[PDB]
Amino acid sequence: KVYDLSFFMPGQTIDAEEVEVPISKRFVDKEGNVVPFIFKAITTDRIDELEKENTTELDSQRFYARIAVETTVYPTFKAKELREAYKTEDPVEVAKRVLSVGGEYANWLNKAIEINGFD
């Protein structure tokens, strides 16, 4: 019954969010309002290169952290400005120094994992 594939193509398939989430109340702007993090799922292809990139035996901790860094649009921990200021070229370390309250860091990770449709 000739199947209609237009729905699974770019000129159509609704695209992934850009979800704002207030990961921490310690980040505020000039007007005292919380600055939420902006997340946006990465691609399945990309999650694949990351897995490969962290396997030898997979470093999950590292794997997930890298996913979170890339799923996080604002702030992006790869930004030169953040690497400079926090004095580390490791975007995952930048994240640990920025989300310096345990719970925030754990929450950020999970939101990212969630934003990518996992569980």
Ligand SMILES: [Mn+2]
């Ligand atoms: Mn105000």
